Amino acid sequence: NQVPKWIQLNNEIMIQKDGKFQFDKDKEAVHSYFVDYINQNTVFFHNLKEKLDYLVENQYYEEEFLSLYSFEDIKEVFKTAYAKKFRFPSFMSAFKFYNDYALKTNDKKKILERYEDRISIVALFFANGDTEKAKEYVNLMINQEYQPSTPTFLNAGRKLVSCFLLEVNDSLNDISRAIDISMQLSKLGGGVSLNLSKLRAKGEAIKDVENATKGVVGVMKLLDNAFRYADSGAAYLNIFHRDINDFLDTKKISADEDVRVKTLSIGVVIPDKFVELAREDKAAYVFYPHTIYKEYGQHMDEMDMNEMYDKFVDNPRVKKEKINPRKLLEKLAMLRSESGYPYIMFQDNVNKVHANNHISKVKFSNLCSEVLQASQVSSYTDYDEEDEIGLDISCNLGSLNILNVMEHKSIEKTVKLATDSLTHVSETTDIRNAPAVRRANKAMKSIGLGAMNLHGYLAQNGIAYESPEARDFANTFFMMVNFYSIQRSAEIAKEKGETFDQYEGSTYATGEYFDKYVSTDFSPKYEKIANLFEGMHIPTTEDWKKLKAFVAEHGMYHSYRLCIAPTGSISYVQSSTASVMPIMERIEERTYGNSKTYYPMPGLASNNWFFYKEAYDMDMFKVVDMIATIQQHIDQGISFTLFLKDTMTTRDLNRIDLYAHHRGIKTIYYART
Amino acid sequence: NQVPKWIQLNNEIMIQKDGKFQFDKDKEAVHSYFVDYINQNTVFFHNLKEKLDYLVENQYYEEEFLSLYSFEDIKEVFKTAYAKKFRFPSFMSAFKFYNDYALKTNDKKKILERYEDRISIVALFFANGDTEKAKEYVNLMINQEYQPSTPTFLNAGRKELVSCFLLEVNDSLNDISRAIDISMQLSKLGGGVSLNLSKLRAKGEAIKDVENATKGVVGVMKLLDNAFRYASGAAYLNIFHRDINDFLDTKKISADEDVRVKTLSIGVVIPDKFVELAREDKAAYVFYPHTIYKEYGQHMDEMDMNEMYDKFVDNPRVKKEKINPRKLLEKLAMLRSESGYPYIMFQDNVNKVHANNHISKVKFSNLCSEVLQASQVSSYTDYDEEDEIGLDISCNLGSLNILNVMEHKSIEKTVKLATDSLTHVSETTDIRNAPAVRRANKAMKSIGLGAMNLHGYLAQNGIAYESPEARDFANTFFMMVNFYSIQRSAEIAKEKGETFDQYEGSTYATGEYFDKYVSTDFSPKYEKIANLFEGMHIPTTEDWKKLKAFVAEHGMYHSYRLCIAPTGSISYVQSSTASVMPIMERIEERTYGNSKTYYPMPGLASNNWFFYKEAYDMDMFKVVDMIATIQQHIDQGISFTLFLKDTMTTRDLNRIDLYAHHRGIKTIYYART
Ligand SMILES: Nc1ncnc2c1ncn2[C@H]1C[C@H](O)[C@@H](COP(=O)(O)OP(=O)(O)OP(=O)(O)O)O1
Ligand SMILES: Nc1ncnc2c1ncn2[C@H]1C[C@H](O)[C@@H](COP(=O)(O)OP(=O)(O)OP(=O)(O)O)O1
Ligand SMILES: Nc1ncnc2c1ncn2[C@H]1C[C@H](O)[C@@H](COP(=O)(O)OP(=O)(O)OP(=O)(O)O)O1
Ligand SMILES: Nc1ncnc2c1ncn2[C@H]1C[C@H](O)[C@@H](COP(=O)(O)OP(=O)(O)OP(=O)(O)O)O1
């Protein structure tokens, strides 16, 4: 019943020694943890050869790519991995990896893969042919300079993408196909979110008889029962719809028995016209979209609300409904004060900066509220009848540490390797049950790259989070990031000579995206910021012009490059902070079982106590301006999370909302208190 | 606010005039009803021609088959229909037809089709070419000698047609998707759809990689219960299964929130081995059927329990579970004492008399608990992968009056016409979303014929319901019915020369079904019974031998012929009793709205008060013996309904259950109290 030694040592840090914390004990706890639990459950082997032979003959490793080299080259790779003599810096830095991510045995009671093992297996998977490139991947990963995404880091060479985005056309057959594909992807563990734009609303005619449709709530009920069957997503909705009130009455603290969704989140799509009507204090008109489909032939949100709203008001054919926008934003503020639900996307900020609006305009987002790409709906006909295949969105992920990049200045080569890595991942991927995801993943070739560790590095260097210097720093940094990113994409496009489809329809072929960079140079405006990037080259606008010419030579290989995800579950292995959202508390406290695990933030010393500010004690406006400065280079959304208090006000909340709409923040997240 | 005249006249019957009822007022109420509500809402026309032209040009009648004759022949058919000068005998005899079944207008406020109209349209639909045959259908129907089934009587020549669907669910994710798809497809067609969950793996079991991963049968029931709420059937289960207790905990008066099915009924399949184990007071062993599928390759209920039960006990591979059968029948008696749920099928009584056991054995039944045919499961593979098509069951229905048959002695010609009618109906049927139903309905060609009006005719003639004379009467009657039925099937088989597939595999080609009729002649054993059939020919066993030879010449066209359904909703139009179940109460009382509609049973006079017995005051054993005498000629099940009282006993209930198992009653129904 006694608590073991390392947990007891980890509980020692809260003892006040001269008003401080016992940080130096922490390593000792880690030095306990590698003696009394880890090195007494590892399966023992003589050397490498039999080890790998035992790993093959019990159905663990996919033996194909592990047969495509010599034994000696793999031995050199493992030798390069063990030559680091790597150590962990913190207590959770081991515990989150040797409990869940690292490979266990069949009885789930022993440990096979060491920390070099998993990384070097990932390295040979990203190699696909070159030994020295695999060594480059090792030197990239073992210095914690790059982190692949969660399911890629898990399921490399065992028995892959955690983000799926679909559309539901309007038929019975379409709803059947949708529930089919959701149950298919549900066992694959990824993130699956739907959208209910083109559906007819409640109390409407079904092809023969008026007032026959049970509406959106029944489809939500079927999906809520549907995800309860397998190993949880969400759904979005554009606001110009009658049942939007019933779409928002689901998340309710006085929850109805039938109106009860504990699985799917919800979210609202809002263009500028509704914002205008809520500002100027006038009426609003939600519609019956099936009447619009009968009238104009197209669907509702496939046209501009700013161009067509009063024209639909003027049409006697479209049956309408008048409501109050201001009371509706008040109700949104109340429901976000309850939890923070739903999600919010401002599409006009997105499409006016989007490159690929010539295919379609972005209407929705994933569960992770980040990926904003084109989407064409399919049409699933009857059994012997053939179908028509639209386009879908499937985004594999991956971020990186800012800190080690700043330590080593190999940011270019880092992007060079990570781009090829995610390229080979999207090469490898295949799904054999949803054909539109198949066609789009072959077609669009969308990769997603981001970064964590913003708060901690700049807080450890002694720069406040609300400083303008950090905003200029992030501006110059992400400018150079996007620069080398497009540079590598153009290089690979020259290597293959095969861009994505309808490349001339993009703004990339015209250089309209490049028109921001031909002027308005992003040189550092502070000396202390300039000392940080001091020691390496920073490009000029003429370098952007040479880049524009080199793009105009061939083109770009990818259609999308960047994403920012709240990668907290693999934040702990990199032993760092979250992404760009600053930290909540200086000390995290968990109870694994009969235990009080005490996690300090990395870099917690006496001097930098003030730069480790608290999330409840910050200017939200400067945070939004930081995220807007970050937004200057990112194609997709940014995982912006609101940090609130009970003492705050929905007046101030909606002021922050309209402030972010005025700045141009794409999406937000669930709010915390 | 005043009650109209005819309802006030209909409420007059409960006034005691010399201790009697005001029967003679009732016709007066009917004579009121054709003056003050019906003949003041009929759309008025000059004559036939413009009438039909107006009916075409507003999308009511399917104009194809109504273009395949002359105008004059249709005029002769309508003239023959109006030449009857038909009247209704009772008050509900109009009210159940001019309120729901007869055709209304688009605003649902006026009446177009008269009572001749609907019948003669059905007549021309059954004609398909011959005017005189249509006149024969008129002379059949307008004397109330035959009644087609409910959706055929509704949707003839309008804007599917068979109210009975039976499916199977193979074991995959894809199969469950296909099952929910087909259920939602048939749900808008309004028919009866019931499933079966035999071949599914049970709760807490391995899903292909990881032990204890299956949520079990309850989640699939939850999905189906949500599924039918969107657009109502049932499902069956064989008892040798671990989750059978959880399969019976759904219908519970102390209902759980999650375990709550207000839509689907449930039912139990029981062979003789479990009956034996419950009698002899020993243990029982339910199984994990996926282990059996891994062991023997086949599925569980595709083999004999009597041959394999102890062999599965002897296998160490099959994981088992020991339970008490006697306490389980006690729990069944308790749950039937709660409501009467679930349903019960004794398959060994069925298969030992079934002709077509060479294809498969019957495992389940429909919602109406009557149709017991073969069923091969399909296998629904992935998207580009092709599937394999099994066999399904789809049974259109139809019964007849016994009374007018006894009045006119045209029983042979009646069967001659009704067989061709249901034949043409099964010709006409097509569904374009469930391919196995398509293939089976083309293949098996199963028709279903029955009869109502057993209790009332023999009660009006002055013969008690519990008499042996009625049992001999029904024996001789249904013997001759089945005789002429097989005679007409052989005639049509000679007409086409194309029997159903695998006809030589049947017992009909071998005459093993005919071996009962070569001896043991069913001559009437009472003089009073013999006077009823007196005046017409009754066949002999040598006539059965000639029938056997004529069958051996060609064969039989159909694989199934007979069914008995509780056709109460179209009992009222024929102005008669139900089918073979005797009546509950002598007077039915309903409240349409602010009203007390008082329905007397037909033939209610002072003399026959005693022969109109009450259902709570009868010998159940003689009822079961009556149904067993009826069972001597019917291939399918019989809609046997239990009539119980609160003063009765589950001891006596289970005694009746085992009594019916000893007699050989196929299925039972929900019990009433
Ligand atoms: N933080 C850590 N990360 C990884 N391994 C660790 C960590 N802490 C201890 N160990 C491992 C390494 C060794 O196998 C064992 C402890 O030996 P350790 O003292 O840490 O290495 P070392 O040999 O380089 O130092 P020393 O020479 O002082 O013994 O457990
Ligand atoms: N029985 C039903 N109950 C509820 N909703 C239904 C039902 N049947 C169909 N629907 C709903 C969901 C469908 O998306 C929508 C239309 O159904 P569906 O028949 O598949 O469209 P359709 O392609 O045949 O033609 P249309 O565009 O005129 O509706 O109404
Ligand atoms: N039970 C009924 N069934 C059908 N129609 C009826 C019924 N009762 C009354 N009517 C109809 C028939 C007529 O159109 C009208 C009533 O006339 P009705 O007296 O019944 O016929 P009738 O003309 O043969 O008798 P009578 O010569 O004595 O008037 O309503
Ligand atoms: N994620 C899941 N959650 C619950 N049940 C599942 C899940 N995935 C599959 N199943 C259930 C329902 C399926 O009928 C059953 C097996 O699934 P499935 O993969 O379709 O079978 P299979 O044809 O691929 O091979 P096998 O016969 O070995 O199961 O287990």
Numbering used by the authors:
A (entry chain C): 4 to 162, 167 to 238, 246 to 687
B (entry chain D): 4 to 162, 166 to 237, 246 to 687
Task: Reproduce, without paraphrasing, sentences from the article in which this PDB structure was first reported.
Ribonucleotide reductases (RNRs) catalyze the conversion of ribonucleotides to deoxyribonucleotides, a conserved reaction that is fundamental to DNA-based life. Nearly all aerobic organisms use class I RNRs, which consist of two subunits: α, which contains the catalytic site, and β, which houses a subclass-dependent metal center. Contrary to all other class Ib RNRs studied to-date, the sole RNR of Bacillus subtilis displays class Ia-like activity regulation.
Because enzyme activity requires both α and β subunits, cryo-EM was repeated with mixtures of holo-NrdE and NrdF (abbreviated as “NrdEF”) under inhibiting conditions. The resultant cryo-EM map revealed a NrdEF filament consisting of a single-helical NrdE strand (gray surface) with EM density corresponding to NrdF observed at higher contour levels filling the helical interior (green). The resolution of the reconstruction varied across the map, as high-resolution features were distinguishable in NrdE but not in NrdF. Additional density was observed in a hydrophobic cleft of NrdE (green) that was previously shown to bind the β C-terminus in other class I RNRs. Density for the NrdF core is significantly weaker than the remainder of the NrdEF map, but density for the NrdF C-terminus is observed at similar thresholds as NrdE. This discrepancy suggests that the NrdF core is flexibly linked to NrdE by NrdF C-termini, resulting in high occupancy but significant variability in orientation. Thus, instead of forming a buried interface with NrdE, the NrdF core density is on average placed far from the catalytic sites. For both filaments, excess density at the S-site was modeled as dATP.
